[model samples]
Every structure is written in structure tokens, then in C-alpha cells.
Target chain A: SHGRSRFVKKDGHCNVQFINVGEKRNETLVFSHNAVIAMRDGKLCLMWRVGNLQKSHLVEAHVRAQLLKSRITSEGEYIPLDQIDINVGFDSGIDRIFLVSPITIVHEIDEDSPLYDLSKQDIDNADFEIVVILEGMVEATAMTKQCRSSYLANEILWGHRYEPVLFEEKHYYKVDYSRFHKTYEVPNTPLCSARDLAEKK
Target chain B: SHGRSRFVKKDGHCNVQFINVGEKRNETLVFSHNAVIAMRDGKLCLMWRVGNLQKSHLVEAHVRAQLLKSRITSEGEYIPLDQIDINVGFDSGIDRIFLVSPITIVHEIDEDSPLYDLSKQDIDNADFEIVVILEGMVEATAMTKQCRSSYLANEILWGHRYEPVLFEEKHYYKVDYSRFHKTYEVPNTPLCSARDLAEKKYILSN
Candidate 1:
């Protein structure tokens, strides 16, 4: 109950999921350790970053494939950054942003490559920006350290009641942080109140 | 200058003379004696109420005949009350006020009469009225008195401005006073002031 987390669906179906970052009762959908898919220059761009360490190449590739397939013929093609077909930039090391040109492609691809047909694909995709977080950052980074383990030993997967795996069953799949290959812990600071000192003492 | 009179035309023509009733120098055209022709009941009504008088039946017939010959058509037969028209009433006697209707005459030839169409014969005639001051206590009636003498005197032969008359000129004419004869002169008592009395006394002495 203390370190609570929740997963959100994109719409009616569970096609996409979001990690709820704040209090369980809070309405805001704050996410950390997310991937953002955008169009930069004229190619589809995918980015992932986080304060905690939880990298899922499969999730990233899953997101990338979803983005590539998700096109809007009425609009224009998706543009990626850091390639000839797109241009990319970053503000802080963790935050990435992309800009895409509507009419032209920036990245170069072989004529035989499957990605090359992106130009020929329908541009009906209404251009948009998306931010996706693979795993909830708050508990993965803080609680994993409290347990002194590289893996989440006793953490619960919070799925909504309507998820195919109901909320009770969703708790079965615990996070294997060991797969992430990195460790992060919550920092401890001085208690500002006598109540906090008493509790600590 | 006080009692002198002259003849002038209404439109300033010497040939068509209008007898000026007042003194020549006064601006008011006072009639010392004059005659006016009126048409009433299909007859040439003549009225002469002031000045000299004369009577003749032969002249009456002749003047009536002449009036028939010089019959003027009534221009406006109908008139609104506010518009001008002929007015006839009896005040001490029968009096008429004409505004629109012009005087005219109508005649029919009679096989019984010898002078049915005597166009060559000259007729002596006059046109005048009589205002008789009666002494009896008769009911107050005001009717226009027709001048009998003018109609009778007008039978005589007369000429225009240059032609001189062979006989002495007859000035007065009689009227049919019987229709409008009355027995009283209603006292028109108007409010008199001391100034009026003083003026009257001075005038009497002068």
C-alpha cells in the first residue's frame, strides 16, 4: 500500500501501458524511465532513458515496430532523428526530443532494405509525440535498493481490474531487475521532524 | 369737395362710368345715387334705394326685354357656404347679397303681345330701388326692394360716351317697393361714449 503503483491502458483496450508515478489516489499520470517515439527529419525516431536502470530491448523494439506500423495515410510519414532521414537532439542526458519534416526524408537506406519502403508507405499517420515508460521507476529504483538486491525480490505488478490477468493474478509476475544489469537505490536524507527521528531511533 | 361727386369706372375706363357716391377727394366710393341690377326668380331685378326716383310701365317692359337680350350666363351655379354666393334675406325688408351669381334675364315670345320682337324700337329704361320709411307698426321684415323706376326709365334711348342725347337726361328711377315695403326702422342702438356726445354737439354747432 505504501509504495503503490498502477498500470494504465491507452484507451479501452490494453494496447499500451503506462506506469503511474505518484500516489495511488492521485489523478496525474507521471511516468519515469519511458521511451518516446517521434518523427525527426523524415524518419521514425525512438528514444529511451531513465534515472533508474531497467532496460528492455524487447520492449524498445516492440515500441519501435508499433510506431513504424502505426502510420496515418491522411497525414504524413514518421521521421526519426540521428539518421539521414531525421535529426535528433537531447537536452538533459535523460530527456530526448525530435523534430520531423513533413515532406522529405532525412535518413538514407538501402534500396533492398525493408525500412526503405517507409517512404512508399501511407503517410496517413497524424503526426504525434508519444512518451512510454517500460517499468515503474519509483519502486524499482527505491524498493530494490531497500532489499539490497539487484532483482526485485518481492514486488507486485499492479494491473487494473479489466486487464486479461486480473489485479490478483497480475501480482504474480514480479520484476526481475537482474535482467536490467544495473542497480539504483533511494538516497536517504536527514529527517526534518522529531516524529521522523523518533521513528528512526 | 364735401358733397361733390363724379363718375369713374370700376376698372378705370371712362366709357363704362361708375357714379362715385362720395366726395371726389375721399377714398371711399360713396354712391349719392346709383342702381344695381340683380336677378331674382327668373327676372332682371333692379334696385335703387337712394337719391332721385321715377316710374314708367312702358320703360319697365322695355328694360325687361333688353335684360333678356343681354342675358349673361351664370358662371358658377353651385357654391359652398364658405365660398361666395348670392344671399337673399328679409331684414326690415327683402335684402339680397350676391357674391357669385351674375344678373341675367329669360324671356319667351308671346303671340298675344304686339311687341314680341321689336328689335328696332328704342326703349327708355332705368335701374333703381326705393328705401321707403314707413310709419305704421308692421312686423319687422327685411326684403330686397326692387327698383321699379329704373326698369321703366331704362326704356329710353341712350348712347355711349361721345353721342349726345336729344332729350333731357333722366337720373332717378322707381323700384318695386311693395314686395319689401316695411313700417319700421329698427333703432340700431350702438354704445355711445361721452366723446361721441361731445363730437355730436360740436358738429351741430358748426
Candidate 2:
């Protein structure tokens, strides 16, 4: 399919919808529509995918996470938290990544993170939003590309995690786009905040 | 100097030593000899520098941090912790980095991180060692290169932060190798473990 777009999130399921920007150019950069906030290995994580139609080059990639909290001073408006206070971490492969395969950028949440104090109940009731901005450069074209996505408090999955999409083959590693939006339910997840869990321990 | 190798941090102040791999090769990949772990923004951060002899190409770069904990199974032996338990968080720029300028790799320590439980006292008294492995490929050569460095507990700087080396020039960016290893003393840095700090915060509650 020259110009193809896939949406597999059936009835408010996985929010990761892949979009093909243009049909004429074969080297268009593609990004996931929604930023997924899911629980992985008992820790909160922000997950998304990046890819291209053909073999491409990525000069550098940067991810910034912001917490949008409702401000009492402003009516129907939200203010983002300071960059110094936002405590999301990136997995390796930040500096240079070979854009041969689809890359999944994983942001592991920290204990002192803004998202740390959020519980399942708090997330459901909280009027906060999480904004993510991913920016990078195309090595071949030398053009900078930026992608923006956000997740509401209700969209945060407390007891679920993404399924494996990358597999190791004999010759090389393979990435399955079909399973990109797949997620599975995890058991024994705490409904309380990370602080509460640490206090109990 | 077209080809340069600068070393600062007199008398073992900072272990981050930059080396120009080759003089003839203008675009040679140069990495810091020793990795520096220091306190930054109240969090333990692993810091290092990566550069090229000239404007070059970097396909991808990967960094792996390992802790060598003492294991009594054998004499004078140590074992690295599992990757699942390594709680180091990277400061963006892992996937794609433009090699036009020197870049600093910063790995922030987590409260649940393996490096989190270490204290200033524990680091001085403990025998644990931290190893950093950096691997990447050069786009010009299409050849993969790997660099490895290690730091003992005492070598971890608890109250220091790297000085700014990257400055914005009028037309472009400028990186000064002279100040690469220069670190300034940071005040009010905690001497206790991250977990302890978190617990103390809960005692009063933030």
C-alpha cells in the first residue's frame, strides 16, 4: 500500500494510531497519533512509535513531557508544569538511531516524577493532561520534524502494558507493525499512588 | 589546533578526559577516556562526552550502565546486576544525534534505580564499581565502534557538576574542549541515598 493508514484501537482500546503523512514521498516520517500512558513492570510508562516509509536517517531525537494541571486563577484553562519538575526518563538510543526499523520510544517514569503521585482514582478524577513533544532531524534531508501528542487522565491505563512488537531473528531484528497497538492486562497492580506503595513497603 | 587532545581536571579532580583518537583523520570519533558520575539537579547523573575530529556522521549510539556488586561466590569476584533492575533514566537524544557538535550523555538516577540507594558515605566505604559501555556506528565509515569506561564508588563526585561547554555562537554553536572536564562545586547536595530523601519527604510529606 503506497498511501496507507492503520487504526486498530477498537472502541477506545489502544490509542496508538499510525498515520502515513503523504503518498507522493516515500520517506515521510510517521508518528503515533496518541501518547500511551500505561503501566509496565509496576512502573508508569509513556510509550509511542516512530517510523518511515523507506530506509531513513534520524540525526537526533528529543522527547519532552509536560503535565497540564487546572489552574484556579484561569477559567477553563490549564498550565503546564515547569521543565525542571517534570521527571520522565528516556530509554537508550537517544543520540543516534538507525531508522531502518520502527523505533519505539519508551519513557520510564521516575519515583520523584510528576506522574508518580497519581493513583488510579486520582487519574480518573484528575482534570490534568499529559503533553508530549517529540522532535528530530532527518539526516538525508536535514529537515527538522516535530510531533505533538497528549493523553488525558482518563486515558491512562493503570493495569495494562504493551505487548512485544520487536523480535530477534537470525539475520536481523524484525518489528511487527500489526502488533504495535496490542496491550495486555497486568495483574496485582496497585490502585494507589507510587508514594503510597512505597510507604507500605 | 586542527587536531587536538585536551586534558584538564588537574590532580584527579574530574575523570572525564577527552582524547583525539587520530591526528591525520579529521573526522575521527573521540570519546572521553573515563566516565564521570556527578550530582546534578539533586540527582546522581552519569555524564560523559562524545565528539568527532571534525564535522562527521553518527548513525547511532548506545550506552549501557552496569553495576559490579561484590559476590562472595568466588574470591575477589563481582557480578553485574540484571538489566531489568538498572533504574537509570536517559536525558533525551538517544535515537538520533547530529554529529556536527560534541554531545554530552546524561543518565539521571532514579529513586528506584540501582544507583539510587547509594549514599556519599556508602560510596566512599563500599567496593562496588560502575561500568559504562558506549557503542555506536559511524555513518561515514559504516563501521561500529565501542568504548568502555568504569568508575569506583569513591570516584563518584557527589557535589560537582560539569561546566557548560556548549555555547551558542552568532551563526552556529561552539563547543570548547577546554572547559569539558571543568566542574563546579554544587551546594546543598544531599549526602544520603535517594530513597532516604524520599522517605524524609514523606515524614513531613510534600
Candidate 3:
């Protein structure tokens, strides 16, 4: 395929070619929405989805992940993965519901989070990426499928507000998510400020 | 204007009137999303959204309300309106953005919350309405618009999950929020459970 990518198995029969990448930047898993950054506990945090577009085809599908961080020792030991690596565990402190296809992932710069304590400016000056690996299967072919993407610090917007898109039809309402990744306006400050609500030692 | 609802002047033209035969079930403003019950600090708490239906226009819209619970004052002065008020103070903890028409509202039966200590069955038996008044402007005509709704415990779905609707076009994609208020499936348990780890002090007091 065009210098980008092509997938096939052992005798090169089943083929998958990605076209017009202009429409598919960061296709890591094609979840389709951009990462959202918000302030929490005096630091900038990340929140976004990784898999939902595939839900369109439920011949039968399931998706899951490993938070990369929180699963290791700074001294570099292989700690066994826990439910926290897959879904919310005993720490987040809130009972939230998440539906299928698109998995909502939120990460803060806590002591264990790889992103620990990076200021808003720190992210801009520093260049790094959160490598997220997503694995699942295409019901049509029943073959294992996997993809990866990186969350660069600059991709996360700061000091911005998302405008709600609205339209209607008979008996109900609809919202346009096209603006999902677009930030229309900026506020006085980022959601979490490293200055005011810093973590208490 | 189609004989559905309208308002008018005192000078004697057919003024639009918003009358009713009785309370409507799940007002158009109504959408059912589940409220998973949890034992937080030995008491029950709830998280839910309030308004998402677009009234077409909100050019200069201003909205407010009261969480009404019928209780008399100990001093017998009839204090009325309960404690579900005034926590709307500006707290800049999270810089989250909202798109439109709806606001997520959370309430827990804390000592100060209006619903404190009410049994789970009480909600199923109660008949009062937390009358929510919303006044704004019509996006179409730029005229003043006003609407009312209620949180009748029975209508709030206690078991469900919202099914997301997605679509894509040449320049954009859309998420059909019609399914926004409707939870499509049910789950065996909630994402969090606290009973297993209850603190010893409270466990002993009980």
C-alpha cells in the first residue's frame, strides 16, 4: 500500500489497506475522538476514548487495555496487572459507568502516573508520548487486531471550552460531535492549576 | 403557535397559555438514564443530569431552581425549602467544558442534603415534584421562553446504561444524543462497591 501501511497474514490473502490518511490521523485504534485535558488535583490530566468506532460492527467485539504506568515499579519491577489497569479500581473514589466500543481513559500526574507533576509549560517544552496499545478482533474475519498511538503533550488543549453542538428531528434532539476535537474558546485558566491546589505532602 | 403553547399581551389578543390537564408523565424534558445506588460513607448518594433538551434558543437565557422537600422548622416558623440549595458557588477545581442544553446534577442524602436518610423505598412512594423552572429565549423568534419540569422519583431509571450513537461525514461526525437520555442495557453490578471496605469505626458503631 501507499508508503503508510498494509496488513496481511501468512500467504498474503486477507488484505487491509488504509486510504486517504488525511481523514485518519493518529489511527492508533480509530476511536475517532481527540484527547481532552482538564485540571485535577493541581495538575493537568488526560481524558479521552480509545475504541468505539469498531462497535459499529458487533458481529461480536470486545476491547481492553493496560495503563502502562501504575503497573510497574520506578525501580523497574514487573508488578502484576490489576483491575485498575483495565477499569477503575479501588482508588479513583467515584462509581462511574462506561459503555462499550469506546473506552474512556483518564490519567492524572499522581505519584505513580508516568505524567506525574508536569506543569502546563513543562508539557510544551518537554516532548514525550504516552504509548497506548489497544487489542481486539474484527468479527468479520475473526482475526486478532491490534494498534498503537501516542499522546503528545501538545495535543492536549489548555485554557479552552468546548461548545455544545445542537440540532433536532421529530420527537428528539441530536448533537454534532464534529466539534468534539475542536476547541472554540479559551477560559481564564486551565482546569487544574499547579499553583493553588498542589498535592499536600 | 400551533395551539400547543403561546403567551400574549394584556391588550386583548389570544395570549399563548401553558395550561395543563394534570401532570404529564416524563415531561418532554424527561429522559430516563439509570442512577446506580451506592453505599457511600454508609449513606446513599445519586449522580444524574438535569436539563439537556434544547428549547431552540438561549440567547440571553438565565436559569435557576429549588430542591423542594416538605418539612417543618423546629422553631415552628415554617422554614420551607430544604437544604438542597446554594452549593452552586463557583469552585474552579476542574476545567471541563459543556456543549449545550443539559447540565449533570448530583445529589447525595447527606445530613445537609434534602433527601438525607430517606429509605430507598421512599422514593418509589413519594408524590412531590422538585419543581425546576427554566426561563430563556426562543432561538428562532428571539422571544422570551419559559418552561418547567419535575424530578418525580418513579421516572428516574434506576437500572440502565446509555448506548452511544455515532456517525461520520466528509468534514465532521455526529453523536445522536436522542439516545443520550435512554439507557439501552443493564449491568450486573456498578463500577464501584464500598461495603467490603467499610471503615472499622462506622462498622462497629452500627
Candidate 4:
């Protein structure tokens, strides 16, 4: 409840942001365009799609995570799990942002997903690429448009979130769209590491 | 010179576009990331960067149209005029747009280049790829950022200019960015047939 927005200005602009309470960095899996991986206690499979707005207006964003895994065969060469060459995206949508604000998506660390609670040996020999696709409805014109951009997990800085104070006073407005990926913080707590959360549930 | 902007309107944001008034499509060479060879009349090499604004705030766009050309060698393959591979962009930004409005980048055919008077035969045998690099300062925060994107020459529509009605009424103005590349029209004039122009000038002056 720390963030407040103002369409309150005589101009029809509205300000909004998503705030996570209890300082819990929801580390999980899957995200959208311009994505990167983030970690809390080294167990949560968290990914984020920083602000991917348009030239004119903001939109309601939705993303789908199509996971790609690699396999090393008898010859010691890598091969695909789905039997196709490079370049792929899955048909799903949930990794989305409600407003113009950025959103983070995570994964369930189960017996199946090796990335969650993944150990050095679990990942050292493995490969994964999270293909993120985004679809959104432009608020001003009310037409839905889709755009795609990508990121490698290694390219996503882990254990960080860019939490720049937008404003400290009235009209103390700030929106750091350009430097979204640049601003990151290592999660302060692994309190509910994905492994424990999964076990507890 | 007819565009005004207001961050003041609570619900009303205005968008505008650049328009070419003359019949001359300014046919020639030049232009960006993920480029396609667009044409006006028949010979001018034209390309456009459509999403002319950013979410943070639009800034003055200064693009350097770095044109890259190819050559036919006795070796039986087209190779870089400069020693490299893939595609190219040469350094001249005037296939540029100004006044903070998104204008199309077009070029006239010249002696040094013959890519687009392409004779279908010329184009059918030619090779191309376009690269775009942008450096701009975020107006509100005074932050500068640079980015890259590219397009294939085929991705650019040939013989067309996409112009739209920027203003229909007060508050009814629209900038059709989504269809920016989707809309295009062939210019009325062959403007200057690069090869023919070069040769005619060569003969007349001699």
C-alpha cells in the first residue's frame, strides 16, 4: 500500500505501480519480452519482463513462457527435447502485466523443473531458454497489439531489482522505463526458498 | 510546422506525423536496423524507422544513414565495397526526418550507387541487409541511451509511401504507427532514373 497513482492531474494520465509486500521477492520461473532471471536464496525461479510499452501509449500486457531444454546424447552433442531446430515459442499466456507497470513471473520448483532449487550439478550440464511473448491492449486506442523481444537467462542479472524512488513529493513523479533492466537488487531473504515452499505446500 | 504538444491534457494526448508536400519522392540511397529497400517512383532507395517515439518521452531523433554498397568481382561473386560480409549501412543521415516528427528516409540515385534502379534484374541478382543504430537522450530525465535493430531490404516495401490523415478533427487526430510500414504508395515521378540520369548528364555535359 506504499504506492499511489494520480489520474488526479487535470490531464488524463494515470500513474500506477506493483508493490510486493513482506519483502518477498517472488522468485519463480517464466516471463515476457526483455526478460532476465532473478533469485531469492538461490531457489526461486524468478524472471521479469521490464516495461515494454509502445511509442504512444501503455497497454495491458500478457506473456507466455515456452520453455526449451537441451539434451546431450550418446555422441556428446546437444539436441532438442521437441525434435526441432533452434527458434521456438509456446502457445500460452499468463506471464503478463496488469497496467503499464512491469511484472515478474516465477516457476514452480517441482520434481520436473530442474531450474528450481537447482544445484550446480543440476544446471552445469543442462540448457534452458525461456521464450517470452507479449500481447496487450493499448488503453488509448483500445486495440490489442502483440510485440516480441527476448533475453537469455544468463543475461538477466540475478539477486537484484531496480527499485528507484519515482518521486519523494507531490508531483514527485518518476518512471524509469529505460533503465528497468539496469536497476536490480539481490533479494534480501531466501526465507521461503522455492524448495521449501514446494515441500510445505 | 503545424504540430503542437501538450503534457497538460488529463486524458487527451496528441500524436503527429511528417508529410512530404512535393511530387518529388526524393529518390536516392540510404537508411536502419532490419531494413528493406523501399522505393519512390523507380530508382530512389528509401527506408523508414516508424516507432518514432519512446514511452518515456519523445526526443529529437538524429540518425546517421550509413549506406553500404556491393561490387561485382571477376571472382564471380558480389562482395563488400568495404571488406566485410552480411549486409550494410553507409554514413549519411540526410535520408533523415526532422522537427521531432517521424519522416520517411529516402535517397536519390547517384553515380556511386545503382542498387534500386534495380531493373528487377539488378535487384533479383543483388544482396542486402540493413542495420539501424540509435542514440538519444530521454528528454524528461536527460538520460542518454543507444539501441540497435535491423531489417532486410525485402522487408521494406518498394514504390510506396505510407501517409495518413494525422488530424481528422480537434482531438480526433491519430498516428497509425501499427500500420506505418503496412501503408505505402508509389511516387508519381520516376523522379530521376539514377542510371539514365547519370548517363544523360554525362552526355549533355560532355
Candidate 5:
């Protein structure tokens, strides 16, 4: 006897149906602005901006504190920024997330910089720049705008007692901000055989 | 007025007269016979007489001793006796004079001799011939008879060994020896100057 079999009951929808999904997530991920911590001789120098700023300052009090903590001297013993440890904190929702990433920014000291004259001890007395990025949900918007505005408006006013003696003799140290660019997107591969075949074919 | 004349006695021997001093004291010098030393692989091997039967087994023994002491392998160490240090003694009657001279003899090894074996430690090991000459000497004697005799005798002995290896298996080495005949003489300037004046007079007369 000829018979027709249906997997779905008469009152129900089909068990299997193909559905087209829309475009994948492609939103650009924004990160905290860049900060530079330079060591001249042995003193640390901090220069940073949140959103945008015309210039950065060599903070004296912060520089002195870093020099005291790092045991820096007038003799230059500046280690590159990549060799230090950094801690960053941002408030997310009701909880605060603290991320401690080792120093990643690298600063190339010009041979002609005044700090170059200072011995290793002097450069060690420099300061470090701290950048905070707040993202995700309710708290992320507020923290992001706050960080941007604070850095842009130059609310952080730090002074230096000892001007870089060579800064005047030689040109001041300027970071090439134009070369910095943001990137996003993580790469993945198809795991299923059907997906693999479809992609290959 | 009578003039008184004094008579002086004249001796015939008083005037200068040139006499040939018969022969100026045996000034002719003689040299020892040329010596030959065969070299093999840069080391002294055998000292054979060019004409005489006298061979210095003492020197040969000393050389062998030095070779062993220096840890020199028997390969490529053969040098001829004429090439070694030469000390010539002249018994000048009153005092014995010594002259040290270096002689370089360039000769090819004879092919028929066992010493001429190219692969052997010494040129004496191969079958070959060498034509050598005494250099850096005031005068050299012609050794046509002596050299020919030595070559013939050595070749005969070498031929016997060469026949078996060369004729039987075609594995024998070949060598050639040729001696240069022209002797080079340094110019005698004093003799040339005396001859030049004589030549000028003769040309004018002619």
C-alpha cells in the first residue's frame, strides 16, 4: 500500500526548516587611549591624554613619588616602558574591575634628549602615565566619557621642579601620535564538515 | 891648465831590470770532488759516490736518526746529499781554512730505479733518473765519465727492479734526468779593462 509519512502532526509546524541569519557582529572595539611613561636618566616622566589633548606635561610630584618608590637617581638608569608593570581599574555596573597588564607601550629615547645626559639614576626618577578605559553596559558609558573629558580638559595638573635640563638645549620629546591606529576582530575557522565543504566549494 | 877628472865605478846590476819570477808560489787551488746526495720526500736519503766508492754511512745514519727523532713520516721527506750543508776545508799549511757553501742541484729522478717510485716515501724508492750540477762554486770540474758511469750502474740496478713491476704489472713510475752544460761565469772587471786598452792600440794600428 502506497503511504505518505509526515514527521509533524497536522496541527503543528514542520520539524525542520532553514532560517537565514543576518550579518555577523562587526562593531569596532574601542580601547583606552594610549599613555607614555618615559625614563630620562633615572627619572620617570608621564605624558598621556584620554580623548585628545594638544600637549602633555612632565608631572613633578608624581615624578618624585615614582622616583622615591623606584629608587631612581639623577644618573640615568631608565628602563623601557615595556619592562615595567602597570595596573588599570574601571568601574563596571555595581562592581569594579581591576586589570593589571604589564607595561606594553614602548618609548624610544632620542639620543639628543636632555635626559640622555642624566645618568641611569636620574632617568629612574621619571613618572608614568596611567590610562583607564571603561566599557560595557551602564557604567561603561559614564566612565568612558569621564575619562575622555578629564584627559581632554587637562584636569590633571602636575608640575615639575626640575625641568629636563636638556629639553631646552634640545627639542622637547614628542610622541608620534599619528602612527597609532585601532584594530578589532578575532579570527575563527569552520568546525563542521558541512560548513567546511560549503566554504571550500 | 890640466883638468882632473874623477872616475865613478858603474855596476851592471844597479839598474832596474824586469825578470820573470818563474812561477808565483803554487797559487793553484784544488777542490774536493763534487758530492751527490739523493733526496726522497724532502728528507736526506742516500749519499752515493759520484765516482769514488766511499759512501758516508755515518751521515746516513745521523740523518735517519734525526728523521725518527723529529717524528717525520717516511713520506715526501727526501733531499739529496749535495743539497745539504757543505763545509769545505782548505789545508793552507799554516792554518786550516773553512768555507761554508750552499749548493742547489736540480736533477730529475731516474725512472728505472726503485727509488723513483713517486708514491714511495723517497725519490730513491722510485725508478727514475736525476741530472744535477754543483752550483755556487768558484770552479767546477767536468764529470762526463764519472756521471755516465754512475748513471749506467744505477740504471742497470734500477732496470732489474723496474722490469718486474713495470713489465709485469705496468705499475712502475717513470723519471727523466738531463744536466745543463753551459757554466755561468761572473765578469772579471780588472781583466776586461786591461784588454780594452790593448784592443784600442791594435785598432789604431790597423
Candidate 6:
């Protein structure tokens, strides 16, 4: 998936591509919203939403941070093995999700993560890319598919939080699709790298 | 990956297969220890471990709870589609792990989880199986591999906790491989299904 990324840079905020299920035909094996990079629990994180419109059997997603650096081999070929495929967590610990409801995927930037050394300054000055690979299966068609999207340095919001979308009702869980892409500015977020923050801790 | 399960039932506790990295010639893509099903944070969960021995670029692992059910199609074939591939979490939410030190993987049994409806009684009597698939790439060999293992109902510990095998050292994290499969008996755990617990909340709150 090239051309324009699902996430866009504008308005001093990271804008997510929001397409309501009914607004138009939905694409299978695709995320309902664009991914965002923001500070969560004092750590940088990559967040996105997935729904049934994307995959019927939404099994798992993989996140990777690719540095712009390249190295030439002894044979004279340049390779970007600088890609770091990191771990991911759902809003909860659930891995396989029923796309019937949209769930936010979280990739916390920590010591053991790919973007552990990333800082807000690096986000502004460094050339890097965060790639997300979403995979699922369609039981009806008996086929599995993967859809990929990414956010660049300029497309991340250093100090922001996505509005909560999932809620617990009396008997069921409630999701406000209207607020899916809405983000709020937070206060007192640091601009240091995760490594520096952990050192200070 | 089936025979005697890596996790076995014994001593009123869930026992994991602990094979040290140097115990023998290490397998290219195998966990350092067997998987375990235990209680954590008031929920039933499937726990496992993966390291460099298991995978190099350890990308991800998938957990599935398969219920013992069968259906016969009109075409006269018995098929079992009662498998629920649930979500998983590493000790800290780090998906890709460096396996230089072992990390505990957790699959919490929650409302949206596959085993959400399972109860302690179910663990005792229900015929169910949990399958775990670990996938990773070897930067040296430049090849990908997957290791699969599972635990049966009798292999789960209903009222126990995996002893904490990870410790924070001054400048580095410490992993106690000796305590990897150790478990402690907990007190006052309920035997109800996640649905029953939620229903009580529904009744008390409403």
C-alpha cells in the first residue's frame, strides 16, 4: 500500500483516515482508522483501530519501526535491515479479535521495543517510518489477507491522546464511532526519548 | 507437536517442560520452557515463554482455545471449527522480544477473550485444548520458522500463580530460569465463569 499513507499530517495534529462503515464500501483486511503515534502512560506509542469491515477473523497485527539508514554489503548491495518488528498489544490483552467491534491496537515504546530510543526531537529531525501490518481471514471466502499502512515522522503527534471509544454498558460494550479518530491534547508530556525517560526513572 | 504435552499435570500443580539452552543441542525454534495455564490478575490465562533459541527475530505468537465439539456436514464430513484464536500479551506488552532473556507471555481470559466463558469447573471437566504458535525469523539462516505446542484441560492449574521469574537489576533485567516453571498456590479464587462474574456486576449495579 503506497501513495498517500492512511495517516496524514495536518492541523498540528496527527489526522487518521476515518471512514464510517456505511459511508462507503468497506475494504476487507483494512483498519477502520489510520494509525497514530503519541505519548501514552509516559511512553511513546503507535495506536490504530481495527473493525470487522477490515477482517472477519482479525487474528493479529505486526508493527515495525524502520530507520532511514542503509548499509552497503561487501558485495555492494544496500539493504535496510534496520527494520525493527516490535511487539503489540490490543486495548486489552486480547490478540485475536472479532471485527464486530472496533478495537485500538497499542505498540508501547519501551526498553524492549523497536522505537525505544526514539524521542520527540528525533520525530522532528529524523527520517523514519512506522509500518503496521494487519492480517486476517475471511471464513466465507476461505481466504486470508494482510493490509499494510504506515505513519512517517511528520505524521505523529508527540503529545496527544486518542479519545476513548469503547465503553461498558449495562449488558454490552458500547463504541462511539464518531469519536474514533478524535484526539485530545494532553499536558506535561515530555519530549525525551524512551531511553532517557527510563534512565531518569 | 503432540504426544505427551510439554505442560503436564502433576503434584497438584501445572508442570512445565524446562529444558535449559545447553541441556542438549538447542533446537533452532523452541521455547526454553513448556507453556502453562494459570491464574493472573483475577483471570485465567495461558502463559508461555520464547527466546532466541526459539526464534531470532521473534515476531509474534498466537494462542487459540479449541473446544471439543464436532459437527457433521451434509456432505458427510466431521469438522471441528470450535477453535478460538485469542489475543496475547508479553510480560510487558513488548511483542517482539530479544530472547537473550526469557519473557513470560500472557493470554488473559476476559470478556472478549476466547476462554471467557470457561470456569474452574470447566477446567476440571470440560474437554478443551489450548494451542500456541510461535513464529520468528533467523537473521543468520535468513529463514522463518514456527513452533507449536498445547495444553489440555487437566494440564491447567485453577488456583495457582506462576512464580515471578523476572527481576529488575540495577542496570539490567534479571531472569531466574530456575523459577520459570514454579507456581504458588493462591487462596480465595472463585470457580465461576467470566460470564457469571459479569452478570453479578450487572445485577448489583443495575
True contacts kept of each: 0.00, 0.00, 0.00, 0.00, 0.00, 0.00
The better candidate by lDDT, 2 or 5, is: 2
Alpha-carbon deviation at B28 in model 6, angstroms: 5.2
B19-76: candidate 2 lDDT, tens digit per residue: 4333556436655554555554445566666665554334345566677763544575
lDDT of 5 by residue, A1-201 (tens): 000222121221212221121131311212224333333232233333221211211000011001112334468776344322222211111112111111122122233222223322333444533334332222101111222211221222222111111111122212222322222211221112222223444
Give candidate 5's TM-score: 0.12
- Per-candidate TM-score, chain A: 0.18, 0.65, 0.50, 0.56, 0.17, 0.67
Better of 2 and 3 by lDDT: 2
Q: Candidate 4's residue-wise lDDT over B1-206, tens digit each?
A: 54345412565343433343222332111122223344445345645553444434434434433333334434232222211212122233342233233455444544454343554345433444343434444455544433333443445455555554244334433554444444545554344445765576579989
Of the two candidates 2 and 5, the one with more favorable TM-score, higher being better, is 2
lDDT of 6: 0.52
| Better candidate number, 4 or 5, judged by DockQ | 4
The candidate maximizing TM-score is 2
Model 4 scores a C-alpha lDDT of 0.41
The candidate maximizing lDDT is 6
Q: Tell me the interface RMSD of every candidate, in Å.
A: 67.4, 19.5, 27.2, 22.8, 54.7, 21.4
How many clashing pairs per prediction, in order?
64, 14, 12, 49, 71, 8
True contacts kept of 1: 0.00
Select the stronger candidate by DockQ from 2 and 4: 2
Please give, for residues A112-187, the per-residue lDDT of candidate 4 as tens digits: 5544564433333445565556665443343555654455545444444433323323542344343444454545
> Which digits, one per residue and each the tens of the lDDT, describe model 2 over residues A14-52?
224333333522233344434455656665665665554
Off by over 4 Å in 5: A1-201, B1-44, B50-127, B137-206
For model 3, the superposed segments whose C-alpha errors exceed 4 Å read: A1-116, A119-201, B1-45, B50-65, B75-97, B101-103, B133-146, B159-171, B184-206
Instruction: Please write out the lDDT profile of model 1 over residues A3-25, one tens digit for every residue.
Output: 13333334522222223323433
| CA shift of A117, model 2, Å | 22
Tens digits of lDDT, candidate 1, B20-85:
222344111111123323222222222322211111011001112222112233785443222111
**Residue range A1-201, candidate 6, lDDT tens digits:** 332332324543323333444453434434423456676666677676655443344334333222222334343323222234555644344554534446667777777775678777777775554555544544454344444454555656777767876555443444556676577776667777878888986
Q: Cα lDDT for residue A163, model 3?
A: 45
lDDT of 5 by residue, B42-130 (tens): 33222222111111101101000000001111322111111111112112221121111111222223332223333222323332322
